[PDB]
Amino acid sequence: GIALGMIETRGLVPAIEAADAMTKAAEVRLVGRQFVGGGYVTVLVRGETGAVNAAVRAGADACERVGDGLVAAHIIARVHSEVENILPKAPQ
């Protein structure tokens, strides 16, 4: 599936918890983890729309209480072609 789930946090530890919850909740693949600068860390998963919905909801609830918390939990069902050039394909 080509649906994108994004979770942003202050700091890496809530991002790790959110990614763990996201992958445990639904059939989604962790596609990246980006340090944004300033403490922002974003975790990106790909999958089917329903799966990504469930994963992002679970990740948001899981990481809301960890560290400095959650910034954003957004869902894009279909990403434009141009946006796939700024989306990492594998996590380093």
Partner: protein, 81 residues
């Protein structure tokens, strides 16, 4: 109102939040006719013959003055073929 047959169900995961939890059915007037999607305010099954209201009456038929529906099932025909 129009007399329709229920083809199947339709799921749109990312549909607007104002659509609520209401189910959506793919219906046609007759097999092979252009498909439409109706808000299922009745709870019917595929193969049912149903009554569908359009225009602004479908909004209140689906539960609210503000509901985003232009086609709502409002009844199952007792005897149709």
């Amino acid at each position: 109102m129009k007399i329709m047959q229920v083809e199947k169900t339709l799921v749109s995961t990312n549909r607007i939040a104002d659509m609520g939890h209401k189910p959506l059915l793919v219906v046609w007037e007759k097999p092979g006719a252009p498909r439409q999607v109706a808000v299922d305010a009745i709870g019917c099954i595929p193969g049912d013959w149903v009554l569908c209201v359009g225009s602004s009456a479908a909004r209140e038929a689906a539960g609210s003055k503000s509901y985003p529906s232009d086609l709502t099932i409002i009844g199952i025909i007792d005897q149709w073929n």
